[PDB]
A paper describes a structure:
The circadian clock of the cyanobacterium [name] can be reconstituted in vitro by three proteins, KaiA, KaiB and [name]. Homo-hexameric [name] displays kinase, phosphatase and [name] activities; KaiA enhances [name] phosphorylation and KaiB antagonizes KaiA. The crystal structure of [name] from [name] revealed a hexamer in the shape of a double doughnut with approximate dimensions 100×100 Å, whereby the N-terminal CI and C-terminal CII halves of subunits are joined by a 15-amino acid linker. Two phosphorylation sites (P-sites), T432 and S431 that are both located in the CII half were identified in [name].
To analyze the phosphorylation patterns of [name] P-site mutants and to visualize potential conformational variations in the vicinity of bound ATP and residues 432 and 431 at hexamer subunit interfaces, we determined crystal structures of the [name] [name] single mutants T432A (TSa), S431A (TaT), S431D (TdT), and [name] (nST) and the double mutants T426A/T432A (aSa) and S431A/T432E (Tae). b [name] mutations xyz or mutants KaiCxyz are sequentially shown in order of sites x = 426, y = 431, and z = 432 where the wild-type residue is in upper case and mutated residues are shown in lower case, i.e. Tsa or KaiCTSa, where the residue at position 426 is T, the residue at position 431 is S, and the residue at position 432 is mutated to A. The structures of the TdT, nST and aSa mutants provide further support for the conclusion that T432 is the principal phosphorylation site because it lies closest to the γ-phosphate. Moreover, the hampered ability of KaiB to antagonize KaiA with the KaiCaST and KaiCnST mutants could be due to their altered electrostatic surface potentials relative to wt-[name] as a result of the lack of a phosphorylatable residue at position 426. The combined structural data expose subtle changes in the orientations of the H423-I433 loop region harboring phosphorylated residues relative to the γ-phosphate of ATP compared with the structure of wt-[name].
Residue numbers in the entry:
A (entry chain B): 14 to 504
B (entry chain C): 14 to 501
C (entry chain D): 14 to 498
Write the structure that this text describes.
């Protein structure tokens, strides 16, 4: 073949993105990690997808987990392997030493199994194979130099055979050896490592394609999740800056605010509402979510602080009976503490839920509520995933944030999200004549014009009331004014 | 079979939550940890609850712990394991060594053993099996490869007998290798990790469902404790956000306050009293609890800075009679330094103290006192756990809090409980003509209206009173207001 | 028995509360540690107390140290181990190798020794046993496996004879495994790790009860102090928020100042005196320390910054004389560099000195001098130690602190010692018309009225004099006043 290397899509969401095509055909790939990174699965689901998507008969070589169970478990994702076993579209080739036997059977069986393996490829006319825990095969009695030669025997053959392989391997250090013997490493053409790194009690899964000989791939670890629908990696690094941009408008929910933005927000932008605690934000969100239920166009509300009944009561006080909203299925409300899942499972449920209610708007009440306990970056990386999907996805977005410090909050945001939104509305407390009076102002809008005036506003059983600006004050922004009361021009 | 993997219910508080159902039935679940982590308990509590909440007889294997003691120790949790074996719903398959050395019996292992076990199982209808410290068996002279096959031949047979097992291991490095030989992680079907991390000078026990082959489970490490009633895990990440929230209102205890709050505190919410030291907090607490008792409802005051005595005094000086509330069975003053337990243990002392008195009011004097010493990240999870529980039990709670800075305190909290609370009160000092004056202020009140004004707050013998506001000042929050006068 | 575990007291200062009761009866406890931690001192102290308190004899197996050696060191605490051996109350079993040369003698090992131990137990009707340095025993040629067996043999045998035991082990890394081979860790019913953390050229020994089978014990480590009285532990968490309270009051030494506090300091109260350097804290203490002698009461004043001579000095030119106090025995000045004792000691140095002279009042001149080279937490504890003691012991304790910054200290304490203290006084600077004027005021008092004003006081020959406030001035706190006309 005088042409470049040929790859093969695994149909594993996000993987074929990282691999600029996917596992190279004809060559064997090595995927390893510690006890639980998803390996077993990464192979199984590597085969399944093949069957169901191109009917490329798979051959699953075990070594420890009994064949019987490899199925019993695989039904957790809705994969009735039993079937593909009947329909000869996949052959589970048992190779796990029974409860008894003898010893000193070194390379003895390795030269045979390769005769057995070629049998299922030959017979079932296979194309994709996946040996799981090849490691427990050397877990008999062998040195490092002993491992490099038993493997190279297999891959060798399989490359002649032409089959495309995947090998499972165990590791004990998350960022250390690449496999117990640190030898398989240079016995593969491609090495992929799966990591389930701990951290402050939080578990984060990731995947990295260390090497793929003769081609390009995505360098670095990528957060993946294991769910009811198999390994799902999120190439938050992939996704291009190919976002749609319409000039159309939508109503903020406050006619007097819709003005201040030159006519509203854009059907293709991210709106950030920031302020100290109790500035309005939650109200905003609500008057944003509601304005969507108005024009009978479903939308979602993601509240991570308040709850089911607490958001009804509190909103109902401002008017807007959310009740009829859920009924006329033009608004559904999620809710759940951020501590209920890592930003990996969250980012997901976001998109996942968006794919069943088909939004038009979307409001995340408190962004700083997610950020909680998570690392700086691990968070920015979360905005992007959200701000990104909900932009190339026609979804308008409203993100609420709390500047951990009032009257003096020398910055819209604190996490540095400021530079990834299209509109910056900020609510702040102003101390006028010994009283905490609010003040909303449109800080920025890349598209439209928007008002540049700082205006106070009061909350009421009526909702937001954007009143007059502080036409006669100074240092207003700080929060601690100093009225002018200038003696005119002295007559 | 075509179904998913059905899990048995351990019956350990919260474990099931973490495991999502329980131990994969008919399968071998693992449980290793450094010594003193709990294991043996967990693997024993495994049976007892089963054999007494479902009735499934159990055969507890033991490699080192003698049967007498395995029974002697269990009397630590009030469990009579003697009985269970006096009825055939439990069997101590004593596999402990004998003080007579004797080489050659190392082979009889597994194979000859396995039969013993099963022989027992059969003689009891054993549904659950807890083999403790299987690791001390190959503590004769075995390799890493050797053990793998030794195990592969131990789980297998037990997997066959269609019985659910509990394998207990041990390790050394707290985070390092999961189980001694780095073989039990990849060889097992279920792996549980019992850690007893030092982290400072205190120790925080924690459990982790590392991996359950075939199903889902709570990823991560979760806090837990061992008490007379056994293991007690608190999955402060699996508590739903379905907090019953009504529109009722209880009275704060202070009249002028309730007005400023649009008419009082919602019986279903969490109040946060924050402010420089000396401002007032503890008072608002004492006046909070006074009320619960005036309406003859119960209330608990978890004190973390003063003794029951110094606390009763402070009250008399303010008018209310805590001395009474103690007998009129309408007040529980707990008292205990924050250093007397890891938050892990306190959350429970509280959780327990509540459902031992069903109070309508819970006061936590000085949340800061608890946070001193601990991380800010471990603090937030404690507040959340109490902020949450407190709610779910329709209980109104008042949490104190001292801001490490007096005056010019721009951020409510330096900690940032700020957003996880429903009602925020704010006391602060203000100089006015060479004199420190107190100043109350309702900051946010989610459900209702509430008064903006920042009024002067006077403390005296007759309790706390609210005077007028600093209506003619600029930068009153700055700690040093400039007096202006505008009149035609 | 159909009950819980039976525990035996050790009387080892504070251990019985950390272990909740004592060491589990008829069972062996392993006490490990790196060299110089205190193990033997723990082992001996046990048997020792077993005798002098409960007339309970004990067997002490010594694998390495010589018998006459054990006896000798023991004297460092004033314990006549020779005598207790002569009264047949304790037996030092000597399993120490011969200074000569022999490889074929201990061929019947363990089993052969056990009979001895098991003999002695009965010959001496001993109730307690402590085996010092088992490690050194098989430290010959053994694996992680050859130990677990040998030991378990001994342990079980000692369990059968119903002997409550103590096995001592060595370690290498401080927070590394619990014992040399990683097996005693589990053949033992109970685990005790003695540490010796050396953080910052300073050493701090602490004890932890890893595990006690079927019972309760405080988790984590507590710091201890080997002293002439042997092991002494302080579980600054095993203390209770249960101290006697009151309304009775006491003078401050400064009349005026007492009025601003509702009429004196409470008695059961801890007073904090913060303020920039040079604000007179030292002048309040002395005055406070002195007022206790006039009324005729015993008060202590621990120093950490000024000597004894400089103290008596400045205290003279300020009027009241400290000398007289000492003579009369109505006062006692300590003195000692913070650096010359590890807090936990100090804490104790104070406790004893307290138990010595029995004080009504105490003056800790500068907590924020002890705070030096110590961690926020390590110190936050030292405080709770003394603060919570003076209370349960009903003492009038006035402490001193220094705000690291002058005029404008946007806070009271940097280590937030407040909220633990009852009454906070506050001396600060004020720049008025090119001058450095002083300011004093009560920032909080828990059970009284106290003046809410910021007064200016003048220091001079007679002492501290408090005057009136800065009415017509703004920003008095930021240090830079703004006389507004
Ligand atoms: N339906 C599911 N939903 C969510 N998570 C699941 C589901 N099924 C399995 N998991 C998770 O994925 C893991 C499965 O890993 P798997 O058994 O496939 O192989 P491995 O971890 O790579 O290697 P090995 O388990 O043999 O050591 C489980 O440990 C669990 O955390
Ligand atoms: N019925 C009402 N009448 C008058 N004011 C109300 C009413 N309900 C709520 N408010 C006001 O609205 C604020 C509630 O906070 P809000 O709903 O704006 O959420 P937020 O500022 O976004 O977030 P956070 O929960 O952190 O404060 C209160 O501070 C209060 O002053
Ligand atoms: N009634 C009880 N209340 C509180 N804690 C207890 C009680 N009983 C025992 N404990 C604690 O639990 C621990 C007991 O652990 P356990 O002996 O059951 O198993 P393990 O430490 O996991 O493994 P192993 O002891 O076999 O090495 C002790 O360290 C002790 O502190
Ligand atoms: N009988 C009383 N009469 C007048 N004022 C009192 C009386 N008792 C207490 N006070 C005042 O109340 C305050 C006592 O502290 P308080 O009960 O308010 O708790 P806090 O300020 O929240 O916390 P902390 O006590 O730890 O400083 C003091 O500032 C004091 O001036
Ligand atoms: N009278 C004493 N006063 C203060 N410290 C003492 C006194 N006597 C001994 N010490 C200290 O106590 C320690 C004694 O340790 P000990 O002999 O008890 O056993 P160990 O250190 O646990 O084990 P090993 O000595 O066998 O290595 C010494 O390191 C020393 O610093
Ligand atoms: N005899 C004196 N006459 C007048 N003023 C004095 C006299 N002695 C000291 N002072 C004043 O008191 C201050 C001394 O402070 P003092 O010795 O009381 O302790 P401190 O300021 O609390 O702590 P530190 O000495 O560690 O700074 C000096 O700054 C000075 O202005
Ligand atoms: Mg696997
Ligand atoms: Mg909110
Ligand atoms: Mg145990
Ligand atoms: Mg065990
Ligand atoms: Mg306070
Ligand atoms: Mg207080
Ligand atoms: Mg909010
Ligand atoms: Mg010694
Ligand atoms: Mg000083
Ligand atoms: Mg001084």
């Amino acid at each position: 073949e005088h042409q470049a290397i040929a790859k093969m899509r695994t149909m594993i969401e996000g993987f074929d993105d990282i691999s600029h095509g996917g596992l190279p055909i004809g060559r064997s790939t090595l995927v390893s990690g510690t006890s639980g990174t998803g390996k077993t699965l990464f192979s199984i689901q590597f085969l399944y997808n093949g069957i169901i998507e191109f009917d490329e008969p798979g051959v699953f070589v075990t070594f420890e987990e009994t064949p019987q169970d490899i199925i019993k478990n695989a039904r957790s994702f809705g994969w009735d392997l039993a079937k593909l076993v009947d329909e000869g579209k996949l052959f589970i080739l048992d190779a796990s030493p029974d409860p008894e036997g003898q010893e000193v059977v070194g390379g003895f069986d390795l030269s045979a199994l390769i005769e057995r393996i070629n049998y299922a490829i030959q017979k079932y006319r296979a194309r994709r194979v996946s040996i799981d825990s090849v490691t427990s095969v050397f877990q008999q009695y062998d040195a490092s130099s002993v491992v490099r030669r038993e493997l190279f025997r297999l891959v060798a053959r399989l490359k002649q055979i032409g089959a495309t392989t995947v090998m499972t391997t165990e590791r004990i250090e998350e960022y250390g050896p690449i496999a117990r013997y640190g030898v398989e490493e240079f016995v593969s053409d491609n090495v992929v490592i799966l990591r389930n790194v701990l951290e402050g009690e939080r578990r984060r899964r990731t995947l990295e394609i260390l090497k793929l000989r003769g081609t390009s791939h995505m360098k670095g670890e990528y957060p993946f999740t294991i769910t009811d629908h198999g390994i799902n990696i999120f190439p938050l690094g992939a996704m291009r800056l190919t976002q749609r941009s319409s000039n159309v408008r939508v109503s903020s929910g406050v006619v007097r605010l819709d003005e201040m933005c030159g006519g509203g927000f854009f059907k293709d932008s991210i709106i950030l509402a920031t302020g100290a605690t109790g500035t309005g934000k939650t109200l905003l969100v609500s008057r944003f979510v509601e304005n969507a239920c108005a024009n009978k166009e479903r939308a979602i509300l993601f509240a991570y602080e308040e709850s089911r009944a607490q958001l009804l009561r509190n909103a109902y006080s401002w008017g807007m009976d959310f009740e009829e909203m859920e009924r006329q299925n033009l608004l559904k409300i999620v809710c759940a503490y951020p501590e209920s899942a890592g930003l990996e499972d969250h980012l997901q449920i976001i998109k996942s839920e968006i794919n069943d209610f088909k939004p038009a708007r979307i409001a995340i009440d408190s962004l700083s509520a997610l950020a909680r306990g998570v690392s700086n970056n691990a968070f920015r990386q979360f905005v992007i995933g959200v701000t990104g999907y909900a932009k190339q996805e026609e979804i308008t977005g409203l993100f609420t944030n709390t500047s951990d410090q009032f009257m003096g909050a020398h910055s819209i945001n604190d996490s540095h999200i400021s530079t990834i939104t299209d509109t910056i509305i900020l609510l702040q407390y102003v101390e006028i004549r010994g009283e905490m009076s609010r003040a909303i102002n449109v800080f920025k809008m890349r598209g439209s014009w928007h008002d540049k005036a700082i205006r106070e506003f009061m909350i009421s059983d009526k909702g937001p009331d954007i009143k007059d600006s502080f036409r006669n004050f100074e240092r207003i922004i700080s929060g601690s004014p100093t009225r002018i009361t200038v003696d005119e021009k002295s007559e």
